[PDB]
């Protein structure tokens, strides 16, 4: 079972003996630090952490004993603060005397603004604020996944609109194929749920479980999949029966959309000779709600997509849409699911536009690119202390490393506000109290063991909308 | 609670309908596919087998739940209720699977079979690839352990040249990645992977996994020192950094203590605060209890060099037997910012050119050690190589025209020792010819049971560097 006393960076165990004596309050905050592009970030995932790890009776005699033993061996010394934890146990029945305030989930906020704040509500637990930093800062992952996915949605939005005239199908243009390519089951589910803030397509079904348990949606599920082949279900037929494999698969799923990987031996041959001639009569008969979706999976992504399009355009009846771009018949589409991240996605859709193919023709699939190749440096997710009370006096604290001003931190008690022009600003040094800027956008989400405000996954989806969607 | 019927890539739900009719056997394997990183460390499968695959992993309740999810998820009924119900009734919910695998901690060149998977019941031909997803996640502990080991090789080399030995090598790279990983589960997994090669971690999640899944003779696999963070310094007030430093080293006077010294001005902290104001509280410290100064900003090499030069002029420096400068024993440095395998190598080389022993320094790495890695680094891949259909065995593979690097192996595989003492993977069942001795793979899983396992102690012995051996 989970033990919050063991869920921190080892060294923080020793911190109680390091803060200034007579310190009654430690107040800290999380931002996505500016860097001298990712200009705005989606706030998502804290609620998952509050419910699964922070809430309820999280301290027990047994959890205290257990930590005392591990820490003794781990440190070869008895540094563990047993009294402080016992105090939380006896006084508050093992509930954390902490208040967390946060911007609403889904909100899209410029870099360098306070996203949430954490402080102790009992003077005895000044050390507790930064003990849970480690667990709280992991919010970086769903924040960064939601944000990176959204930036990609924007690109798809841009090219789809220009090549086709509208935004139909946008929410199915970037699918999550990342399940096998992430570092754990837990990560898979978290990361998958973060992608669902922006899209509806995923094959990482753990993602749905998390959303239902921790956020909730009107509809039965927030994510959807279509029947799709893998290399094993094609190659299993044998090197000389790829066409037998192809034909069996599209007949099994003649009524639904169906993705078929087509590069097991030669993608170009399969497209021009197998889909294009031998099996042509099985494609052109299909419904518009049941297209075949050809899936190349190797070679240079831009080059291979353009070659596949060019091939199909000459085997199938292409039309020119109202904006002047080429469109395949409704029963035929293409998905690129190899080597896709934000960079090559941009490369592909630009390359398509240059060659006069609509973005309607294509969907993208992303795995490690979407959920794994991302770190805390991407948005500079950082948890820093900015206010303390020592000897009954509050003082405004911060770091300001001389060789890196980008790592300067904010001062004092903080609040987030709407500017007159409708943008965002963070006020420092308790300046929010002057109330010249209207109301604090941060809300109490956690206080003394209790989750105090929650958001449905729907509200979240609505908060994270593109402006282009909003228009 | 974990439901294996829901821990697979969505589209695999449809695959039992996609194989050729009368397929009785599906046999697949995992490799770190050949294209830096010429050899990988095998680690992490035992965790996966025990946490996820062993025992009764299928129940009436767990079937029902999957049926409902997939019906919505697909907006249609495609879920294989019948295959899963067979497993429940016939084998009491235990998986009819056989997994063979190289020993954990083993160090193997790329492009060799690491593990194989196949169904032990004709009715369950579809099960082999169902569980690809959970098994493929083994890429992560493999890749962390490998990248971690590659870094140790670099540390070993320079420590040896600048100091003549390897004392303390196992504490020269600490895990600081606990906040910079994507999940709690990832933290433990990854921490245990780094501990294969090193003993320093601040990610406590890792000890518990090791104890539960592998086991060590010692009470714990990893260790940490008292250390400050910016909030334990900055809380004193911008004009009291000295009071903070004093309190901290006094509070931890007879044990090692790491103090971040770049809150405001690293170069002032080193030269004026540590080097003058509090100097008398350093030079009186025991060799067992050094102060370790932790810069945390600037160009990592440039900052390490200047910190070293600052300290050298303020403290008594010696020249070890190799001709390298060495700090007094109660004074060391740790760089824990921007450290990854590339910068690690930049720093130790820059140190060597300036005649500073690697004895002086230790590194902490986070995102670079545990987060910024993908399945692509080692080309970790799981592929079908052999099936039986209508009673006939077929060797199967892919060979894409545009990418010969993506070609998978053919037929039944086995791993062997060459006449020169190396590894080879034999394909097409050729291992049965018995020209290359015994298969080095061992059965580790069969029909719901783990059939072979290793202590963390033996894994560590397998993963040792050549220079160590």
Residue numbers in the entry:
A (entry chain A): 8 to 43, 53 to 487
B (entry chain B): 8 to 42, 53 to 486
Could you give the paper's own sentences about this structure?
NAMPT functions as a homo-dimeric enzyme that catalyzes the rate limiting step in the primary salvage pathway for NAD synthesis, the transfer of a phosphoribosyl residue from 5-phosphoribosyl-1-pyrophosphate (PRPP) to nicotinamide (NAM) to produce nicotinamide mononucleotide (NMN). Crystal structures of NAMPT in numerous ligand-bound forms have been reported. These structures consistently display a NAMPT homo-dimer with two essentially identical active sites at the dimer interface. Typical NAMPT inhibitors were found to occupy the portion of active site responsible for NAM binding and a tunnel-shaped cavity extending from the NAM binding site. Furthermore, we determine the crystal structures of six NAMPT mutants in the apo form and in complex with various inhibitors and present a definitive model to explain the differential effects of the mutations on various structural classes of NAMPT inhibitors.
